[PDB]
Nucleic acid binder design. Structure first.
Ligand SMILES: Nc1ccn([C@H]2C[C@H](O)[C@@H](COP(=O)(O)NP(=O)(O)OP(=O)(O)O)O2)c(=O)n1
Ligand SMILES: [Mg+2]
Ligand SMILES: [Mg+2]
Length: 430
DNA sequence: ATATGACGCT
DNA sequence: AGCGTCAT
C-alpha cells in the first residue's frame, strides 16, 4: 500500500567502455580504427588467445577466448594487436593507465565505484538533486539526450533503429511530470542527462566511447547498460521492470550467472526473472538462505540496496600466470625463477602505487594450482610483506609454498604447477 | 591450452 | 586463516 518502499531512492549508473582493450590499441594505431580487430596475448599457441573484439569483428562471429588462428577462419581480414609482454608474461599496464584516464574524468561528476578495469558504478543521486534546482522546472529537451534509449518505449498506437529511439524518447519526455522534483522518473531522466555529459567528456578527452545504464540500483544499471551497446545509453525505469523481467533469463542478472542462478532455475522450475515474484520471501530463504532469499525477493521486483562504494582504487595488487598442459612447472628452479618474474612486476606496480596513492601493502598472498585440479586456486598461503623487494618477496613466497612439493628428489617439483599467483593486500595509509 | 579482482562462508 | 563463488 502506502508503506511499500519501491527501490526508487537513488539514481545509479554503470558505465562500461566498448571493447576497451581494442579501443586503447586503436587510439594508438590509427590503421586499426573502424576495422574488424582483436587484442591477442601470446602469439605462439594457435596465434594467441583473443581477449577483446571490436564490434566489426563481432559481426563475423569472432569472440573472446577464441584462438586467433580460428578467428581468422571466420574473419580473414581480422587485424590483431598484441598485449605487451614483460618478463615472459602478459603485461596489462597500458590498459590500467587508460583505465585511470577514464575513472578520473568520471570522478569529476560524482562518486565512483571502480567495478573492473573498464567499468564503474556512479551514484548520481546528489548531482541529480543539485541539477534539479539549477534547472528550475525547465522541461528537458530531447536534444539533451541524443544517445539515450528508454527501455520499453515506444509503445502502442518506424523501421530504422534511430527512429525507434527517438519515438520512445519523445513518448517518455511528453509523459514527464517536471513540476514534481521528487518524481523518480524525472530524477532518472536528469541522471541520464548528466551521463550524456560524462560520456561526452570521456570521448572528448580520451577518444574512448562507452555505453551506460541509468536506473535506481546497481543491478538494473548494469543490465540497462548492455541493452543497447555500443556507444549508447539506456534508462530502465522502475515501471519498465515487470515487462523487462517477464522474458529476462535468470542468468542475465548480476550474481545469478553461476551456480546460484542455476539452482534457482532447477529448484523452482522457472526460466525468467519475473517468475520469482510468485514466491514468498520465506520460501526463497528456505531454498537459498536468509541473505539470498531476501535479495531475490526484492530484486525480482526491481529493488536492490547494495551501495555504490566510494572506491576508485583496487584493494589488492596481483600478478599471475598459468602454465597449462606440457608447460606445467616440474622443477624447483622453474618455480623459483617464475616467482621472481612475478615478484619483479609486482614490485614495480607496488612502488608506483605507493607514490601515486600514499599507501603500502602489508600482506603477501601466494596462490598455486596443481596439475589436474580444475579449481582456480589449489592452495593459498600468506606472509608479511615488509619490503617492496622482488627477491625477498619471491623467496618468502617460495618459503610458504615449498612444503607442497611431494617430490622425493630435490631437483623436482610434483605435482606440476599450472598456476603461480602473487597478490599484495591489506593496505595502510603511508 | 583462455590475468586479474571483489567478496562470502567457515 | 584458507577455501569457494562470481565476475571482467
Ligand atoms: N574474461 C575477460 C573479460 C574482459 N577482459 C578485459 C578485455 C576487455 O576489453 C576488458 C573489458 O571487459 P568487458 O567489458 O567484459 N568487454 P569489452 O570492454 O571488450 O567489450 P564490451 O562488450 O564491454 O563492449 O577486460 C579480460 O581480460 N578477460
Ligand atoms: Mg566493456
Ligand atoms: Mg566491463
Amino acid at each position: 500500500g502506502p508503506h511499500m518502499a519501491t527501490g526508487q531512492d537513488r539514481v545509479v549508473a554503470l558505465v562500461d567502455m566498448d571493447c576497451f582493450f581494442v579501443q586503447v590499441e586503436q587510439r594508438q594505431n590509427p590503421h586499426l580504427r573502424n576495422k574488424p580487430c582483436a587484442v591477442v596475448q601470446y602469439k605462439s599457441w594457435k596465434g594467441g588467445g583473443i581477449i577483446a573484439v571490436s564490434y566489426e569483428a563481432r559481426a563475423f562471429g569472432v569472440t573472446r577466448s577464441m584462438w586467433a588462428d580460428d578467428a581468422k577462419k571466420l574473419c580473414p581480414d581480422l587485424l590483431l594487436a598484441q598485449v605487451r609482454e614483460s618478463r615472459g608474461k602478459a603485461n596489462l599496464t597500458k590498459y590500467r593507465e587508460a583505465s585511470v584516464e577514464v575513472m578520473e574524468i568520471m570522478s569529476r561528476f560524482a562518486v565512483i565505484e571502480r567495478a573492473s578495469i573498464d567499468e564503474a558504478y556512479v551514484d548520481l543521486t546528489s548531482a541529480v538533486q543539485e541539477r534539479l534546482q539549477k534547472l528550475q522546472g525547465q522541461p528537458i529537451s530531447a536534444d539533451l539526450l541524443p544517445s539515450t534509449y528508454i527501455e520499453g518505449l515506444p509503445q502502442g498506437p518506424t523501421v530504422q533503429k534511430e527512429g525507434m529511439r527517438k519515438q520512445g524518447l519523445f513518448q517518455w519526455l511528453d509523459s514527464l511530470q517536471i513540476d514534481n522534483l521528487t518524481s523518480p522518473d524525472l530524477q532518472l531522466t536528469v541522471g541520464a542527462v548528466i551521463v550524456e555529459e560524462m560520456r561526452a567528456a570521456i570521448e572528448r578527452e580520451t577518444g574512448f566511447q562507452c555505453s551506460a545504464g541509468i536506473s535506481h540500483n546497481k543491478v538494473l544499471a548494469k543490465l540497462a547498460c548492455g541493452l543497447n551497446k555500443p556507444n549508447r545509453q539506456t534508462l530502465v525505469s522502475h515501471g519498465s521492470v515487470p515487462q523487462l523481467f517477464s522474458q529476462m533469463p535468470i542468468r542475465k542478472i548480476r550474481s545469478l550467472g553461476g551456480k546460484l542462478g542455476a539452482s534457482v532455475i532447477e529448484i523452482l522450475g522457472i526460466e525468467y526473472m519475473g517468475e520469482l515474484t510468485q514466491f514468498t520471501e520465506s520460501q526463497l530463504q528456505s531454498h537459498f538462505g536468509e541473505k539470498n532469499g531476501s535479495w531475490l525477493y526484492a530484486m525480482c521486483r526491481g529493488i536492490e540496496h547494495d551501495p555504490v562504494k566510494p572506491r576508485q582504487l583496487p584493494k589488492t595488487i596481483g600478478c599471475s600466470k598459468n602454465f597449462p598442459g606440457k608447460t606445467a612447472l616440474a622443477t624447483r628452479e622453474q618455480v623459483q625463477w617464475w616467482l621472481l618474474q612475478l615478484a619483479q612486476e609486482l614490485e614495480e606496480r607496488l612502488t608506483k602505487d605507493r607514490n601515486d596513492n600514499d599507501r603500502v601493502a602489508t600482506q603477501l598472498v601466494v596462490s598455486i594450482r596443481v596439475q589436474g585440479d580444475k579449481r582456480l586456486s589449489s592452495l593459498r598461503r600468506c606472509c608479511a610483506l615488509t619490503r617492496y623487494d622482488a627477491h625477498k618477496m619471491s623467496h618468502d613466497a617460495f618459503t610458504v609454498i615449498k612444503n607442497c612439493n611431494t617430490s622425493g628428489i630435490q631437483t623436482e617439483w610434483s605435482p606440476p604447477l599450472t598456476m603461480l599467483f602473487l597478490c599484495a593486500t591489506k593496505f595502510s595509509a603511508s
